[PDB]
Write a protein that binds this DNA or RNA. Structure first.
Ligand SMILES: CCC[C@@H](C)[C@H]1CC[C@H]2[C@@H]3[C@H](O)C[C@@H]4C[C@H](O)CC[C@]4(C)[C@H]3C[C@H](O)[C@]12C
Lengths: 140, 570, 98, 107, 123
RNA sequence: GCCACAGAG
DNA sequence: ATTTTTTTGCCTTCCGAAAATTTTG
DNA sequence: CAAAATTTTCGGAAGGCATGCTCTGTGGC
């Protein structure tokens, strides 16, 4: 693939390409896109279950060919592999072979009661606090 | 601490002495010592450490406590349902009572305020202050006294209308499953009960049967299984509420029955809350409200968190394991009170909920929109709902709880060790056994990042190294190391880690209260309460404020751990 | 009869094994004219045959006859005995001479 | 008392403690051709009752774990059918003194 | 020499120290600020613990001078404590060997603590 | 200091 | 990068392999 | 009845110990 730069990976190229593919899929899988989530949590809307909100591999390949930001030709295996990297990050999900759809958690990650899933909304504890809980403790 | 830290400081400011304790023993002893006294803590600790013990063995194993003190603290523990017992007679005719420890009472002590808040929330009495306060006080009295009778509770109330409202609230608690009838079932162990039933139904089969030994064992265990199910399902049949119309034709629970808190129903509610929180991150917010209404409607008749037959040691047969799986899958679906439709959910939606514009079809509590929400719930990647027939839905717990466990565990890893750790863990879990090169090819990030991240993941049993030796002696240089992800080891280790964290937090809080005991005793007086700013020094006031804030933060962090620990109890 | 002692122990019991030990040791001493008083031989036989079986005067016999740790460690296989005592957490009452 | 002829399977040796109040003793016909208690090497074993055992323990002022032990499955113990905790008095004949009494406890 | 060869990634100036920290550095996200619902939940914990601690079932830890003065008269008694054997036990829930430490045929009163909606915790 | 042999009764 | 040994006996524990026995179909 | 699981028996190898108890010298690393 084109990711091999001087014998190793080029992580900046990976991040930019994954961001633009996730951007495209999120535009397709939602009615109005991120602006639909921009105004507030309650005014947002979602597609009906019969709507084909999933994005296939060919549409993604055509979009990344038209964008010409990679500057290198892309095989469908390569775009499939990087979308597999995306679903490994739990940014999107696969509902059918060669079919993907952005999850809502990755949408909320960009921008009440405690839950583990919205951990980014939680603030770090103040210093000089004795009763603070560490995951690394009991095994250090 | 950039400078050198002496072992004095390591021992006195860190938790090194608490890292050598078993998390179960540490948590149970800390909870019992916090709520009950030190003698009960010693008894519970010895019961956890040595297993089952008689009263004589508890006397001879604990120094400084005689038979009267042991019996008194055993009575105190038994009233709060913290100790199970079994009275057995040997062949020689001697009768011995062996006392166990049961996690039910300790979890009741651990979940107490969460239980009270759940009772307050789940019967929509938040609008009415009198009903809310009465429900809170009766639940607190039930938990603090372990089990109580309605007649004894009402003997302390003099107003007739107040007595009627208390009886009505007790009936309302009983009908929705939160208060049940206590019995010797809740004090007898599950393993001993199944052993007794199996032995009885094995000796019931007469001699000289034509059928073989395996068939005899299977028949005896099937009869014991149905008898065990009938025995366990006894307190859920509302036999203690059947006393109707003594006068003026109202339904009241009997004044000669002992009611107690039901932990299984509370854990069902906690499971429903966890599933709601999981669904909030996949399918919308209005869809989450519909899922919440559907789960709260079918919460009481949902299957139990842990099937007790799995705790009888019967899982040593593969056929029994798959039979348990099949029975759970059948009972999650064909229970009459579990299936629901859009019309059933339409009668329980709140007035503020609209559903009108939440759906866009193409690129007033209507049944079609509710059905669309249930469809997008059932069509999501996570199996939130399954459709036996078009238009009817049920919650597939046996196929949803592993997904909830995996998601919670993965997001704990993502929040602690970083998102790259979550990516590596999911890459290893996707394709089961992989090498480093295959990881680098499938997961596009740097090889040294792969190695450091998996080395970090190894320490918490997240990733297990499979060594493939290529020589006669398994040298590390000549061998090749693959990586696999084992779910059970990781879940067990994370459960133990969170349990130890809860125990350490409780220990820290107890130490702080013990070292500020003088100020806390001065402040916790009837006259001083409500007049703290006048009868106390400003330094004492600041110390009291700091101590109370620290205690509040401790209990909030304990609640947040409990929201993160019960998932691995499922 | 048999000069072999464990054979007599298996056939006739421990109490005949004790006579076999005493008689065989006495015969061996008397052939060379050493003239030892047989009360010492009786004591040796009783020590070999007081735990219900013929143990034998060896490190495996002492591992079963003596429950002390320091006595067995000072005799033979010190490391194994000390590590076994540490692992099994046995309590050594200081009553022995060693 | 069960007397088999050639051999007994190991699966039946673990089935003998099946009855709680009763006990089963298995013997071999080859092992019963000659009596072992009539051998000149084997002295006189006499099992003691509970009262006699208590009297012995009171006379020597000791707990039952401090007595010399005799195993079960020992040939003489199998012959007399000693159970666990029973004390047998043994009449030894030594040429030095004459007849003297020793005691053993079944274990 | 056993102290010469190094792995390819490492360098000579990076090894030889072995300073493994004893204090953890990976916190869980539960350490955020408290909220109103969490504060009510925490004071519910505190009130329940106070109720159990002062209840009849405590079994505590394992200047009353002998001299008598006139000031001993007109002195209030501390508090008439409810003991272990002053509770209406359901005898079917207990083993028979624990009966003699309970009150089989003595005075029984059921101590009831009323829930306090107001927050007793001072800030 | 560690090994190595050499002797004495 | 061809290639000696340099006492003799006794003892327990382990660990596949094969045999013996029971247990499922 | 014979296929499959469980248990026992039987070897060869792998470990370990012993190969006195004290005492007096030298020679080389
Ligand atoms: C080819 C030589 C085999 C030989 C070394 C085997 C075969 C016969 C075996 C003896 C018999 O089993 C009878 C006795 C059984 C006791 O338990 C231990 C001692 C005992 C005398 C045995 C010792 C040893 O085991 C023998 C002699």
């Amino acid at each position: 693939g084109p990711w091999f730069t001087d014998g190793e990976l080029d992580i900046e190229f990976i991040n930019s390409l994954l961001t633009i593919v996730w951007r495209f899929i999120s535009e397709n899988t939602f009615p109005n896109g991120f602006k639909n989530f921009e105004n507030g949590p309650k005014k947002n809307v979602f597609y009906a279950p019969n709507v084909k909100n999933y994005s296939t591999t060919q549409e993604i390949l055509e979009f990344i060919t038209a964008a010409q930001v990679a500057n290198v030709e892309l095989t469908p295996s390569n775009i499939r592999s990087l979308c597999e990297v995306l679903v490994y990050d739990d940014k999107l999900e696969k509902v059918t072979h060669d079919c993907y759809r952005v999850t809502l958690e990755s949408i909320l990650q960009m921008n009440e009661e405690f839950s583990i899933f919205n951990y980014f909304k939680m603030f770090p504890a103040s210093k000089h606090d004795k009763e603070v809980v560490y995951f690394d403790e009991w095994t250090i | 601490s950039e400078k050198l830290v002496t072992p004095e400081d390591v021992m006195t400011i860190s938790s090194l002495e608490q890292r050598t304790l078993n998390p179960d023993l540490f948590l149970y002893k800390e909870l019992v010592k916090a709520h009950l006294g030190e003698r009960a803590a010693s008894v519970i600790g010895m019961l956890v450490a040595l297993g089952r013990l008689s009263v004589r063995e508890l006397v001879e194993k604990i120094d400084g406590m005689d038979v009267d003190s042991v019996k008194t603290t055993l009575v105190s523990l038994t009233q709060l349902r913290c100790v199970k017992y079994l009275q057995e007679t040997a062949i020689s005719g001697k009768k011995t009572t062996y006392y166990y420890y049961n996690e039910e009472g300790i979890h009741i002590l651990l979940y107490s305020g969460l239980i009270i808040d759940e009772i307050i929330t789940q019967m929509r009495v938040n609008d009415e202050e009198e009903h809310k306060q009465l429900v809170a006080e009766i639940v607190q009295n039930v938990i603090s006294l372990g089990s109580l009778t309605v007649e004894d509770y009402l003997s302390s109330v003099t107003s007739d209308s107040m007595k009627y409202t208390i009886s009505s609230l007790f009936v309302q608690l009983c009908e929705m499953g939160y208060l049940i009838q206590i019995s010797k079932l809740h004090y007898t162990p599950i393993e001993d009960l199944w052993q007794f039933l199996y032995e009885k139904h094995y000796k019931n089969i007469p001699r000289n049967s034509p059928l073989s030994d395996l068939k005899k064992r299977s028949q005896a265990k099937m009869n014991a299984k149905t008898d065990f199910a009938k025995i366990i399902n006894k307190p859920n049949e509302l036999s203690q509420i059947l006393t109707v119309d003594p006068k003026t034709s109202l339904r009241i629970v009997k004044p000669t029955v002992s009611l107690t808190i039901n932990l299984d129903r509370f854990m069902k509610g906690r499971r429903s809350k966890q599933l709601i929180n999981l669904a909030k991150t996949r399918v919308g917010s209005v869809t989450a409200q519909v899922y919440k209404i559907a789960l709260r409607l079918t919460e009481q008749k949902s299957p139990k968190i842990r099937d007790p037959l799995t705790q009888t040691g019967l899982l040593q047969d593969l056929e029994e394991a798959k039979s348990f799986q099949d029975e759970a899958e059948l009972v999650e679906e064909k229970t009459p009170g579990l299936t629901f439709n859009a019309i059933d959910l339409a009668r329980h939606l709140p007035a503020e909920l609209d559903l009108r514009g939440s759906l866009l079809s193409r690129k007033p509590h209507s049944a079609s929109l509710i059905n669309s929400h249930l469809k997008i719930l059932a069509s999501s990647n996570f199996p939130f709902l399954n459709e036996t027939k078009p238009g009817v839905y049920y919650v597939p717990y046996s196929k949803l709880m592993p997904v909830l466990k995996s998601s919670v565990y993965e997001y704990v890893i993502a929040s602690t060790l970083g998102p790259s750790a979550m990516r590596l863990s999911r890459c290893i879990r996707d394709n089961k056994l992989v090498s480093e090169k295959i990881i680098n090819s499938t997961a596009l990030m740097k090889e040294k990042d792969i190695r450091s991240t998996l080395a970090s993941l190894i320490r918490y049993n997240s990733v297990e190294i499979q060594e493939v030796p290529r020589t006669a002696d398994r040298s590390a240089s000549r061998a090749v190391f693959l990586f696999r992800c084992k779910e059970t080891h990781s879940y067990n280790f994370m459960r133990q880690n969170l349990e130890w964290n809860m125990a350490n937090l409780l220990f820290k809080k107890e130490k702080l209260k013990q070292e500020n005991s003088t100020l806390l005793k001065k402040a916790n007086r009837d006259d001083v309460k409500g007049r703290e700013n006048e009868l106390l020094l400003p330094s004492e006031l600041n110390q009291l404020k700091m101590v109370n804030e620290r205690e509040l933060n401790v209990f909030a962090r304990l609640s947040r751990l409990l929201s993160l620990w019960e998932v691995f109890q499922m | 009869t048999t000069n072999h002692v464990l054979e007599v122990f298996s056939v006739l019991g421990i109490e005949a094994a004790r006579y076999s030990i005493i008689r065989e040791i006495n015969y061996t001493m008397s052939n060379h004219g050493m003239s030892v008083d047989p009360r010492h031989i009786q004591l040796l036989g009783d020590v070999m045959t007081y735990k219900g079986e013929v143990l034998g005067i060896t490190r495996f016999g002492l591992s079963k006859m003596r429950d002390s740790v320091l006595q067995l460690a000072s005799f033979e296989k010190t490391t194994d005995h000390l590590f076994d005592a540490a692992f099994y957490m046995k309590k050594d009452a200081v009553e022995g001479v060693s | 008392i069960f007397v088999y002829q050639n051999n007994i399977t190991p699966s039946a040796m673990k089935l003998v403690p099946s009855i709680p109040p009763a006990t089963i003793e298995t013997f071999n016909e080859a092992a019963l051709v000659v009596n072992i208690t009539h051998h000149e090497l084997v002295p006189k074993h006499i099992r003691l009752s509970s009262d006699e055992k208590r009297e012995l323990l009171k006379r020597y002022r000791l707990k039952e774990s401090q007595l010399p032990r005799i195993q079960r499955a020992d040939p003489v113990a199998l012959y007399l059918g000693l159970k666990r905790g029973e004390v047998v008095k043994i009449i030894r004949k030594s040429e030095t003194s004459g007849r003297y009494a020793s005691y053993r406890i079944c274990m | 020499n056993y102290m010469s060869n190094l792995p390819f990634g490492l360098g000579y100036g990076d090894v030889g120290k072995n300073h493994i920290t004893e204090f953890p550095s990976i916190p869980l996200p539960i350490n955020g600020p408290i909220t109103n619902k969490e504060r009510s939940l925490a004071v519910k914990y505190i009130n329940f613990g106070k109720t159990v601690k002062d209840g009849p079932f405590y079994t505590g830890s394992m200047t009353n001078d002998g001299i008598e003065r006139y000031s001993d008269k007109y002195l209030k008694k501390r508090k008439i404590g409810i003991s272990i054997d002053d509770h209406p036990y359901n005898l079917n829930l207990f083993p028979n060997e624990l009966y003699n430490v309970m009150g089989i045929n003595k005075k029984k009163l059921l101590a009831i603590s009323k829930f306090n909606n107001a927050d007793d915790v001072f800030t």
